[PDB]
Paper text:
Rab27A and Rab27B are secretory Rabs with well-characterised roles in transport and docking of secretory vesicles (exosomes) at the plasma membrane. Rab27A promotes the growth and invasion of multiple cancer types such as breast, lung and pancreatic, by enhancing secretion of chemokines, metalloproteases and exosomes. Reported co-crystal structures show that several effectors of Rab27A interact with the Rab27A SF4 pocket (‘WF-binding pocket’) via a conserved tryptophan–phenylalanine (WF) dipeptide motif. To obtain structural insight into the ligandability of this pocket, a novel construct was designed fusing Rab27A to part of an effector protein (fRab27A), allowing crystallisation of Rab27A in high throughput.
Residue numbers in the entry:
A (entry chain B): -35 to -9, 4 to 55, 63 to 187
B (entry chain A): -37 to -10, 4 to 187
Write the structure that this text describes.
């Protein structure tokens, strides 16, 4: 396989869309907040963001061409309501896109790190992903929310919940078991990441 | 049939990104981190121009850039105000991004247009097609930069190869006048106008930064 021009054109459209958005915020809403989802190919990053923004799910696998993003206007409340414009970056997991996607780790204010509860290797790769984030994000200690996705496939689960909770506590990061197919914990995990980011932004 | 990045190519790019992240964390000594980006067709001399500027050296051998790289330079900038009244020396850390011109790297390099505060747009005085593509590069910058009117300095490079020049001076000055951007004929081999073009771009960006 070769880099096609359709693949390259699609990526250029995303970057054009990103430039337009970033120029409009230069300048309605009160804050542009940027997240990035990452993890092995096929763990469900694109599905998770789609379920969150649109409440929909497609079982067919359409691997992401390098990079994409979705948007959602939401209201955040610390524990008054602030209007938040979320840019939700969606990275491709395949190694062939690794250097293009790493280039966008530095644009994110926090990270949604996914593995697949039905694929043990994706869970073992979590610590490497965290290493790459520590090496490439805006800070060596960025906010991360870990998601074990595909919780609706209980008869195919291989990652024991205890093993996942243990890993997440060792690193100090919140953990959620999610399903992009039925929406379980999706908004809870993302709202947790947003709160972690709003608090760290307030104390700046 | 554009080839995908090999694993050697990808490792080289990842090292650059690692180096950039280290640099970006250090800023949280100097007074300002300023970022430029050089772009243009493959083989016009972007890498050579930046190497001549930071190190004063030149290599005849063509080593095409593996996607993206950058060089660094600490310089002292002094504003120019009324009647040549020059201000205090400000310490500037320049990050000079160097993009590959080959199409197979276009989407990787375009991703970095948004990180630059200004652009060094090069063509090759001995290659008319490199000059004819300048208008497309500028359209690509207007579409992808932080502003639809970012600061650009146009460099016609390889001015030392006078017997191979094919770009007439008139057409390039006319193009730069039409777009409102400074134009320099440069040579990375002997240094002519290299520092003038980069200092002009730096001055443009410091002025635009002042008025914020
Ligand atoms: N049952 C179930 N299937 C899911 C879930 N999340 C994703 N999938 C399925 O798993 C496959 C991969 O999903 P996708 O979101 O494209 O994964 P990705 O992480 O974006 N892959 P890539 O990095 O290659 O773009 C798809 O067939 C999708 O339907 C989930 O929670 N439950
Ligand atoms: N005589 C002369 N040769 C030059 C000059 N600038 C570059 N060259 C030569 O032209 C070739 C290409 O230069 P290089 O800086 O690698 O070009 P580039 O724009 O970075 N190419 P790429 O986009 O593929 O990385 C090299 O052989 C280099 O020595 C110049 O001002 N004069
Ligand atoms: C207050 C400055 C800061 O570092 N923040 C705000 C919330 C998280 C963090 C941040 C991370 C990454 C970016 O990249 C745009 C901006 C802000
Ligand atoms: C005055 C504010 C501004 O837009 N500036 C300062 C100098 C150039 C310009 C700028 C462009 C792009 C970036 O991206 C990092 C920063 C600053
Ligand atoms: Mg995807
Ligand atoms: Mg080069």
């Amino acid at each position: 396989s070769f880099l096609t021009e359709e693949e390259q054109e699609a990526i250029m459209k995303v970057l054009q869309r990103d430039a337009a958005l970033k120029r409009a915020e230069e300048e309605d809403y009160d804050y542009l907040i940027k997240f990035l989802a990452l993890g092995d190919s096929g763990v469900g990053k694109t599905s998770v963001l789609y379920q969150y923004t649109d409440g929909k799910f497609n079982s067919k696998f359409i691997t992401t061409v390098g990079i994409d993003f979705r948007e959602k206007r939401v209201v955040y409340r610390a524990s008054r309501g602030q209007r938040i414009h979320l840019q939700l970056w969606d990275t491709a997991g395949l190694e062939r896109f690794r250097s293009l996607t790493t280039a966008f780790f530095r644009d994110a204010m926090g990270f949604l790190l996914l593995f697949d509860l039905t694929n043990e290797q994706s869970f073992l790769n979590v610590r490497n992903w965290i290493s790459q984030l520590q090496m490439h994000a805006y800070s060596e200690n960025p906010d991360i929310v870990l998601c074990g996705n595909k919780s609706d496939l209980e008869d195919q689960r291989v990652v024991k919940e205890e093993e996942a909770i243990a890993l997440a506590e060792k690193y100090g990061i919140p953990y959620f078991e999610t399903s992009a197919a039925n929406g379980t914990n999706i908004s809870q995990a993302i709202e947790m990441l947003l709160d972690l980011i709003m608090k760290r932004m307030e104390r700046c």
